[PDB]
């Protein structure tokens, strides 16, 4: 006598919020941006190729100085490249070989890396000796992790496959706050430039927004049919993109709380592996698992260019903090810096 | 090139030397994925060939190292983490079973990896286990051998 009434209340709430959303959907981004001059054909060449890995590359991350990038792989080796010179700075061996993601502290002091072992171990780069030692092992996640990101040298936000994101404290090693709003597994994270909100792409085709201090779902976005496999904030911090298996990017907005514009092409019938914006929020690089990534436009869905220098699919990609270049870790154990 | 940059290059070269040594050491290993119902003697046959996270088993048979990753430890959704195990020589199956077989037989990422099927109680190979584990290990080693033949022939362009 209670389930039916609450379910009907939830249905009514969904209907009224969807009507409120549709109320301000009078305009579309395409006709707004039809007047502005398109960028045109963009040619991005593989400036450098970092080799030394011997297995599929699952993730990478640039440092804040945008010169060092740490890349993980199946062989259980964590490598801190020097993008400018393509010479190693460190080569950290991992306890397990199933690392799905890496990270990088904003100060550059600490490095994190996690995977199927349900641990996001934080490494201590600048120690008194010349070897990188594990500094902590954050346990408490029921399932596997997929993205742990560093707020600062002392706060890290994880995102595990047990439908749960947590905010840990490094010295204590325990989660101060827990974010339990998702139903499916979580596959992405993007800390906002002001480091106050983040959006995680779940398996239920819904991406939620949270508050790092409160611990509640501020907003919730739908519009996909398959699991969301990528997430990337707009440089201003008011928009984010969603990459899903349905071969279609989807730009959202925090203030509007609605889809803003779609990115679809029929010739691509393969899913999305990772999405990364540019410095100015104009080019939406999206890496599909059809063995080549391509460059889009954030305003008029113009497939400006394609990065097709990779033997296998592009798994993870990222952009520098100064916008000078992008890199694409692929499944042939190659990192390529495109500029 | 200053002294500091040259010494950094030398350190990087030592790093590549160590990485290449480890890669050559670990290339001779072969990875296998254990997948099945979980209560049909999977641990039994695992201990037969033996003589949080995912259970890992290691053993050598004949100048070749086998790594056997048991997945029964984790009961999460099978499809979501299947993207990590896309590159594996073979999957050993020990006999919802029919649905699991149908799902794994037409996986998009498993269109090249063969499936090894065991009856205790891409090409698919089958064998009926006996008391002597030597026959079963011979069968699995042979099947991995044909998998390696196929991979090498594809690489060289003949296949």
């Amino acid at each position: 006598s209670e389930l039916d009434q609450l379910r009907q209340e939830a249905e009514q709430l969904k209907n009224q919020i969807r009507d409120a959303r549709k109320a301000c959907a009078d305009a579309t981004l395409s006709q707004i941006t039809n007047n502005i001059d398109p960028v045109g054909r963009i040619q991005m060449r593989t400036r450098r190729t970092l080799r030394g890995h011997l297995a599929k590359i699952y993730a990478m991350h640039w440092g804040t100085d945008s010169r060092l990038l740490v890349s993980a792989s199946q062989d259980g080796k964590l490598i801190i490249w020097d993008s400018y010179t393509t010479n190693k700075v460190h080569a950290i061996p991992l306890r397990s070989s199933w690392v799905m993601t890496c990270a990088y502290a904003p100060s550059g002091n600490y490095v994190a890396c996690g995977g199927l072992d349900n641990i996001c171990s934080i490494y201590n780069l600048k120690t008194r000796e010349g070897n990188v030692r594990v500094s902590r092992e954050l346990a408490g996640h029921t399932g596997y992790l997929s993205c742990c990101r560093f707020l600062d040298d002392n706060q890290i936000v994880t995102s595990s496959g047990d439908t749960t994101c947590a905010l840990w404290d490094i010295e204590t090693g325990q989660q101060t706050t827990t974010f339990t709003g998702h139903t499916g597994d979580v596959m992405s994270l993007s800390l906002a430039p002001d480091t106050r909100l983040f959006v995680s792409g779940a398996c239920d085709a819904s991406a939620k927004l949270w508050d790092v201090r409160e611990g509640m779902c501020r907003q919730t976005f739908t519009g996909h049919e398959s699991d969301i496999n990528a997430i990337c904030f707009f440089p201003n911090g008011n928009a984010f993109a969603t990459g899903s298996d349905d071969a279609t990017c989807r730009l959202f907005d925090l203030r509007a709380d609605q889809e803003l514009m779609t990115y679809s092409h029929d010739n691509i019938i393969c899913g999305i592996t990772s999405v990364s914006f540019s410095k100015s929020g104009r080019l939406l690089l999206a890496g599909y698992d059809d063995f080549n990534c391509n460059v889009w436009d954030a305003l008029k869905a113009d497939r400006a260019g394609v990065l097709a220098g990779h033997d296998n699919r592009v798994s993870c990609l990222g952009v520098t903090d100064d916008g000078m270049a992008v890199a694409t870790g692929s499944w042939d154990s190659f990192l390529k810096i495109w500029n | 090139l200053s002294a500091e940059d040259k010494a950094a290059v030398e350190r990087s070269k030592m790093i590549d030397r160590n990485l290449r040594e480890d890669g050559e050491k670990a290339a001779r290993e072969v990875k296998l994925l254990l997948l099945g119902a979980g209560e049909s003697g999977k641990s039994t046959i695992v201990k037969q060939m033996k003589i949080t996270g995912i259970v890992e088993t290691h053993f050598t048979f004949k100048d070749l190292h086998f790594k056997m990753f048991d997945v029964g430890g984790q009961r999460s959704e099978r499809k979501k983490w299947i993207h990590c195990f896309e590159g594996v020589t073979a999957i050993i199956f020990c006999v919802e079973s029919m649905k699991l077989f149908d799902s794994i037989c037409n996986n998009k990422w498993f269109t090249d990896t063969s499936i090894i099927l065991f009856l205790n109680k891409k090409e698919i190979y089958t064998h009926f286990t006996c008391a002597t584990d030597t026959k079963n290990v011979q069968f699995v080693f042979d099947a991995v051998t044909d998998v390696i033949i196929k991979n090498n022939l594809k690489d060289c362009g003949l296949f």
Epitope: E129 | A3, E10, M14
Partner: single-chain antibody
């Protein structure tokens, strides 16, 4: 804690041969490079030798080339210096310094205690015109030393270092690459410069900062130090 204890020396006849066993107890040794810094009695520092990581690079000073050899024993964490034909000017104190090279590293971070050696009886040149600066605590003092050639490189960093040698103590690093600060030093120290004119500024003098300041270049070997400038209360 990090330590580098060396041994040997004490009395040598001219033309002889001795051995110094510099040991780093309980820390990484194969990753670090090592140099040999010899200090003539009541004189400044003078670079002697340097063996790289993996013994793939070995460099001697031009004044000891062919007479000195430097070797390392990684498994037992020892560093060796074989001297041949020990002349009269080789009597000095010999230190052991660690130096690890990578992007963002701080070479010459730690210095050994030093064992004296007694004998019975081109390159970048860097000058410190000032010798003694008697300054009471509390007021900033500027120490400057100039290089013959610009230490700046096409990379954009200048390889000039500053060391503080407290009386009766081994020198320690506090400024590497003319701008940065070594870990474990107060923020009051700060340096600057451009090309050839280098300066060091201390915010305020303490009781423990009294000592002698050295500056050394590191673009290419040999690495010439500078005549130390002493400051007193």
């Amino acid at each position: 804690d990090v330590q580098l204890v060396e041994s040997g020396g004490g009395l040598v006849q001219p033309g002889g041969s001795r051995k110094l066993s510099c040991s780093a107890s309980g820390f990484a040794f194969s990753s670090f490079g090592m140099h040999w810094v010899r200090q003539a009695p009541e004189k400044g520092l003078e670079w002697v030798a340097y063996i790289s990581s993996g013994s793939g690079t070995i460099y001697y000073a031009d004044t000891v080339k062919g007479r000195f050899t430097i070797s390392r024993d990684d498994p037992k964490n020892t560093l060796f210096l074989q001297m041949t034909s020990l002349r009269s000017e080789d009597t000095a104190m010999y230190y052991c310094v660690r130096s690890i090279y990578y992007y963002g590293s701080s070479p010459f971070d730690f210095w050994g205690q030093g064992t004296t050696l007694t004998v019975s009886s081109s390159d970048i040149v860097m000058t410190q015109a000032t010798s003694s600066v008697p300054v009471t605590p509390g007021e900033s003092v500027s120490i400057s030393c100039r290089s013959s050639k610009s230490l700046l490189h096409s990379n954009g960093n200048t390889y000039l270092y500053w060391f503080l040698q407290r009386p009766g103590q081994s020198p320690q690093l506090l400024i590497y690459r003319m701008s940065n600060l070594a870990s474990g030093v107060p923020d009051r120290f700060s340096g600057s410069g451009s090309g050839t004119a280098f300066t060091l500024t201390i915010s305020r003098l303490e009781a423990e900062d009294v000592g002698v300041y050295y500056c050394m270049q590191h673009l290419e070997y040999p690495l010439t130090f500078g005549a130390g400038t002493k400051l007193e209360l």
